[PDB]
Design an enzyme around this catalytic site. Structure first.
Site, PDB file in Angstrom:
ATOM      1  N   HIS A 165     -54.644 -10.457  15.268  1.00  0.00           N
ATOM      2  CA  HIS A 165     -53.835 -10.221  14.049  1.00  0.00           C
ATOM      3  C   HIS A 165     -52.700 -11.162  13.857  1.00  0.00           C
ATOM      4  O   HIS A 165     -52.299 -11.456  12.688  1.00  0.00           O
ATOM      5  CB  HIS A 165     -53.425  -8.754  14.060  1.00  0.00           C
ATOM      6  CG  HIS A 165     -54.557  -7.807  13.749  1.00  0.00           C
ATOM      7  ND1 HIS A 165     -54.333  -6.660  13.053  1.00  0.00           N
ATOM      8  CD2 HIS A 165     -55.889  -7.844  13.979  1.00  0.00           C
ATOM      9  CE1 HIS A 165     -55.462  -6.014  12.870  1.00  0.00           C
ATOM     10  NE2 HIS A 165     -56.415  -6.711  13.435  1.00  0.00           N
ATOM     11  N   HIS A 175     -65.251  -7.967  19.508  1.00  0.00           N
ATOM     12  CA  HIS A 175     -65.813  -6.661  19.599  1.00  0.00           C
ATOM     13  C   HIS A 175     -66.590  -6.446  20.849  1.00  0.00           C
ATOM     14  O   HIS A 175     -67.221  -5.406  21.021  1.00  0.00           O
ATOM     15  CB  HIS A 175     -66.446  -6.192  18.276  1.00  0.00           C
ATOM     16  CG  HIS A 175     -65.437  -6.036  17.165  1.00  0.00           C
ATOM     17  ND1 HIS A 175     -65.774  -5.867  15.841  1.00  0.00           N
ATOM     18  CD2 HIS A 175     -64.065  -6.048  17.218  1.00  0.00           C
ATOM     19  CE1 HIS A 175     -64.649  -5.804  15.117  1.00  0.00           C
ATOM     20  NE2 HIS A 175     -63.572  -5.902  15.923  1.00  0.00           N
TER      21      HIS A 175
END
Ligand code: HEM
Ligand code: HEM
Ligand SMILES: [Cl-]
Ligand code: NA
Ligand code: NA
Lengths: 713, 713
Positions: free
Chosen positions: A77, A244
């Site tokens: 992020h 992920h």
């Protein structure tokens, strides 16, 4: 308390040019972050970070005993706000700890991750910036879990207030497209310079476009947003699947259980937000996005289990405990571990955006290759993670520390090493004289150098005169650069260069990049002489020439100036007034309002305008460096009116006679209108200002010439 | 474009502390306005201003051939924004040329006056500021028209952006009272710190309170607003009647004829506004306020005709050509000259607010006395005009030039001249030693010196430690100053002083003002010693002691700190959160955010809190100078919650045990909450920052001790 922005909400805002003053900076005026970092014991920091990964704090317990996934998210992020359109966002300034990013819904619970890092920040103090530490933490997380990274560079200095960035016009967090301030139009076309699908998201909506759980259509948003962050299909697949491979999402009950984001929270929260009333509020009961997905059977270890699962099962649509759409492999055994209860296991799950990697036909080819060849996946993900986390750091000359990768990547816009003696002061004087004797004019010299240097942007530190990329595709053909005029100038400078270099002994040679800048210096010096003033413009050699093969033409496209008020240039017609686009360019060039003012008023009378436009050329002695722009602009004897032909071009006429004196654009006239900019123009337009104008012009000219010269930092 | 202000409209705004950076300032960092003014030929400027008075320009033709009245209004509006409550506004920064004041309705057409002065500003450049020039021009106007002024001081340096001032909360220009954001409540009680009756007015509404033409009720508004600008009844009557001895109002047709105010006008207007569609738009057709009043038979010459008319006629209520309420003389002959047509004459007229000077019983006594004794009127108006235009300039030491009046006035908060040798370095060391031997504690020494120095405000440059007014009424009795504790410290210091001074030869003596500050220095040195650091605190002697008769006790009342976050002090309960009042105080002390942070964290651990409160005292070594406040405040082992007894006091408890560790107020905890201040606190709370904290603390301590030391500038 009613403010000027309330009364006049459409006025130009100059305070964006005076952010980052010495006033707001807690460090002394001479503090040099690169010096501090160079003495940091990086390996000691990394040992403390390794230990932290598995040292759970009761106020935010670690999933699976390991904070690695949280910290990889935090670093993705930090870097994921970056837009290639303007270079703004990205990890390079540590802006995730300021408003608005610290309170974006996509950054929920990253406030906890940042707080977990305080003991280490505190330990090392000024020798490691928050900006560097967010990225380094991500790397150590990867390492701790078995993944070999591509390297790390330090050198991101901390900032001390929010950057001014256009993130969209929506007044509602996460607003679905098609509202009154929609960032989409047409056939799902996202407005420049944006790179996300909804206000407060990093890239895309994990449930699918505006919440529609269609993997195929979600893939379209993925591709577009990732492209707008400078990543291609291979890099995108690698980054999504790589990320992920670790950790889990958090949606243990309904989202509304979360409290106020950090900027809205009570003072007692001490900088934390999203306080949850669901059960314990944390750990097994954590609520972040509202999804409840765990991708792999070993969420704390690098593996190839994301693609094993994605391809190994058929997926069905289901809902999380908070009602968000997600996917489950029903035919599967319960093989995925629970984050806190060793007696619980779960079926594989996926986001709609994970399935995009299998159901978009372009992505599926890549995904399958990475599935069948996980060493290829590991390498692509290492390279893309480095690019992600370094893309806004600028020239390799800024990279610090012992882990910098030696391989030079095309995306870095690399500059070859200089392996020869540089020209000295006497040589520079001899070259300036030769340039001026060639017949090249002040206008030509100044326009060329401005065109080469003024591609720089401080947002991601791309562009500038280093490299001589103005001679290469695509810069040489940009309309702003006046390609036929540019080709003629460069041919003449390259003959000067060949002659000078051919006469040298002992290895001495000048680059075309240096010569283009020195020639601009000579133009400025001659314009000063034309006005009756002897000045020496400073010049620092050491630029090198990059090849066409070291130049990614597609990635260069975002640096094309479509609006450059400094050359009175507008490529087409825009929604935003031209004066607004001037101040935006000034900010990217790192100029203050006074510097923007001086520079534009000199450029006007030096003949820097595209097309030799007369707009704003308020002088009868063009190619002399005077303050005539300001004197003439501020003369009340002249009355201004918008033209019938074009409401954005103005005629200046003698007020008594009606005779036409001048024409200007909004960029020219704003200096006579805006109350702060007119106060500036008055300083330079006063009778006592000829010396100040010339000095301040040369200083800002020099500053622009040197913006990319991190080799001289 | 959505901003942080939009998402979080009630967050604290720190950019007010970093206005006026070197970024926004066009003059180089060492520019010294006082030095520049000192070499201006003021006589030459004044001759050019005398010439201008009757050099009519066609784009704003002069009334009666003479711009004097226009320029007196301009100067009176420049000064007229000043509020005694916070010292903000006034003429001292030339803020009339910036938003919002440049576009306030009451400043309509003063954009024309200011533009008429451009050629003079341009001529003299940096040697005369706009701020000084607006005042000077007013003075010249008066002189040109026959009125001898009391004097003039230069030294108002220009500013380069709008000041941050609370001008009210109304969202509509000129909104009448009792709206959603009403500035009145109760029995017409105007909210502090405001000093005008409607948003965009200088003082009062010329038609009467909220437009009702009652001279007696208008007088109440005049008295209250003028008192809130530091003027008494005599000064108010002298200023109003003096000003209205000259010139005229402008209301030749309906107000709506005027176009956009300058900040809303098109770019082609070049900084001007209120473009009028009525007839020629200017001169005989000018429309400013909408009133059409000319007060005297000789509007370009000083006379005694204002009072002759006011008392000499009975008045009838009528309407201007735009429909505004005004007054006309019953049965009078047409004796008032027309501004442009020598064949037209007019009956005497007056505003409602002029009639206030006759119909308010207190004013009528003064007005009659001025009518009967016009030399008394002339002297009062000269003195009050000097005060009006100088009241925010600070100590006399700031006054420059050859026209400064020698008379010392009580409103200047005068400081006696020093007529003896000052203490040297050996003497200062000897006095610090005696201070520390007396038994005075670190807490006492530091609290006393903070109380004496921290009254300074940069808005009007009143206050500070020079004068030793802390020993006088009313400062010695202020609650924040802890009067009983203060009296014990001053008694001890005054015996030290008497002893020292008794032992000297030559005329050497130390003032109590210097000693209070030197004693604070010693307490800081001792606190550093208590913490294991060897620190010398700089000290500059030369303050003098002012007498009670040189200290106007009523005018001092506006300097009382009712909120001082630096002492954890709040006098009562206020609308505005305590953190907001902290930043407001910081701004008045001229501190940046980093300086505010360092100073508060040091003061807390030195025992500067009022009443020896433990709130924010986050150390186990009180009276030692360390960075404990920061270290402890940022410790995530501690959890904070508001108390049941009081939502604005908080308890910090061990997260694991529940044991009570600390208590804090909102002023304390904001440094742990606000994202920018927490970033600052983290620098000082780091492991490598104990020496930087001590250094930075001593610097800001010293800055505060020297804020009024214009004798050293
Ligand atoms: C299409 C792009 C992507 C989507 C929509 C996205 C979506 C999300 C969502 C919704 C979460 C859950 C947040 C929570 O509830 O705790 C999350 C978690 C995470 N994401 Fe992504 N992701 C994207 C790409 C990335 C990339 C590029 C990386 C890193 C290379 C990253 C790494 C992670 C990690 C490690 C987690 C787990 C957090 C934890 O264990 O606490 N993702 N993702
Ligand atoms: C109760 C306080 C006052 C009120 C309500 C007031 C009101 C006004 C108004 C409505 C005008 C007309 C503006 C226009 O239409 O052009 C004006 C003009 C003027 N006022 Fe005042 N005034 C006040 C105090 C002052 C003071 C204190 C001074 C100076 C010491 C001043 C000097 C002037 C001058 C010279 C003019 C003439 C402008 C010209 O000739 O262009 N007035 N006043
Ligand atoms: Cl940014
Ligand atoms: Na950036
Ligand atoms: Na002021």
């Amino acid at each position: 308390g009613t403010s000027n922005r309330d009364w006049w909400p459409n006025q130009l805002d100059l305070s964006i040019l005076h952010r980052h003053s010495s006033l707001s900076d807690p460090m002394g005026k001479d503090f040099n972050y690169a010096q501090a970092f160079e003495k940091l014991d990086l390996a000691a920091v990394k040992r403390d970070l390794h230990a932290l990964m598995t040292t759970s704090q009761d106020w935010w317990p670690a999933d699976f005993g390991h904070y690695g996934g949280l910290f990889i998210r935090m670093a993705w992020h930090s870097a994921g706000t970056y837009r290639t359109a303007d270079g703004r966002g990205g990890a390079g300034e540590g802006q995730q700890r300021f408003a608005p990013l610290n309170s974006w819904p996509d950054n929920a619970n990253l406030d906890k991750a940042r707080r977990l890092l305080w003991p280490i920040k505190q330990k090392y103090g000024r020798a490691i910036s928050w900006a560097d530490l967010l990225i380094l933490t991500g790397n150590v997380a990867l390492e701790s879990m078995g993944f070999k990274t591509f390297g790390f560079a330090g050198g991101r200095a901390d900032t001390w207030e929010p950057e001014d960035v256009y993130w969209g016009s929506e007044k509602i967090w996460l607003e679905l497209s098609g509202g009154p301030n929609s960032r989409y139009s047409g056939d799902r076309q996202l407005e420049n310079p944006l790179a996300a699908v909804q206000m407060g998201l990093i890239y895309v909506n994990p449930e699918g476009p505006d919440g529609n759980p269609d993997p195929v259509a979600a893939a379209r948003d993925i591709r577009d947003t990732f492209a707008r962050m400078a990543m291609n299909d291979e890099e995108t697949v690698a980054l999504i699947a790589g990320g992920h491979t670790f950790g889990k999402t958090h949606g243990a009950g309904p989202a509304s259980n979360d409290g106020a984001e950090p900027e809205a929270a009570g003072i007692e929260a001490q900088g934390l937000g999203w306080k949850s009333a669901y059960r314990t509020g944390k750990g097994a009961d954590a609520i972040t996005s509202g999804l409840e997905v765990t991708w792999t059977t070993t969420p704390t270890q690098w593996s190839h289990n994301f693609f094993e699962n994605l391809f190994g099962y058929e997926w069905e649509l289901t809902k999380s405990p908070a009602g968000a759409h997600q996917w489950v492999a029903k035919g599967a055994d319960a093989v995925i571990p629970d984050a806190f209860d060793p007696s619980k296991k779960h079926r594989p799950t996926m986001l709609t955006t994970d399935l995009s990697l299998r159901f978009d036909p372009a992505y599926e080819k890549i995904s399958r290759r990475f599935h069948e060849n996980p060493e290829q996946f590991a390498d692509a993900f290492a390279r893309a993670w480095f690019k992600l986390t370094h893309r806004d750091m600028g020239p390799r000359a800024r990279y610090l520390g012992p882990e910098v990768p030696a391989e030079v990547l095309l995306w870095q816009d690399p500059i070859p090493a200089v392996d020869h003696p540089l020209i000295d002061a006497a040589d520079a004087a001899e070259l300036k004289a030769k340039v001026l004797a060639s017949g090249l004019t002040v206008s030509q010299l100044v326009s060329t150098a401005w065109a080469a240097a003024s591609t720089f942007r401080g947002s991601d530190k791309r562009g500038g005169a280093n490299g001589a990329r103005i001679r290469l595709a695509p810069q040489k053909d940009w309309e702003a650069n006046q390609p036929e005029q540019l080709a003629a100038v460069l041919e003449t400078l390259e003959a000067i260069r060949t002659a000078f270099n051919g006469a040298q002994r002992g290895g001495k040679q000048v680059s075309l990049a240096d010569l283009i800048v020195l020639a601009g210096c000579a133009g400025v010096e001659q314009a000063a002489k034309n006005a009756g003033h002897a000045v020496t413009v400073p010049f620092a050699p050491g630029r090198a020439d990059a090849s066409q093969e070291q130049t990614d033409v597609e990635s260069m496209a975002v640096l094309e100036p479509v609006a450059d008020g400094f050359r009175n240039y507008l490529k087409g017609k825009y929604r935003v007034p031209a004066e607004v686009l001037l101040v935006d360019k000034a900010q990217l060039l790192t100029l203050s309002a006074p510097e923007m003012t001086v520079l534009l008023g000199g450029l006007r009378v030096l003949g820097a305008n595209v097309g030799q436009s007369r707009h704003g050329v308020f002088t009868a002695r063009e190619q002399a460096l005077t303050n005539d722009f300001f004197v003439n602009l501020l003369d009340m004897g002249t009355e201004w009116k918008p033209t019938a032909a074009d409401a954005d071009v103005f005629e200046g006429r003698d007020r008594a006679t009606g005779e036409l004196k001048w024409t200007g654009t909004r960029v020219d006239l704003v200096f006579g209108s805006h109350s702060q900019l007119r106060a500036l123009a008055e300083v330079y337009g006063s009778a006592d200002a000829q010396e100040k104008f010339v000095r301040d012009f040369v200083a800002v000219w020099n500053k622009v010439m040197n913006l990319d010269r991190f080799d001289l930092a």
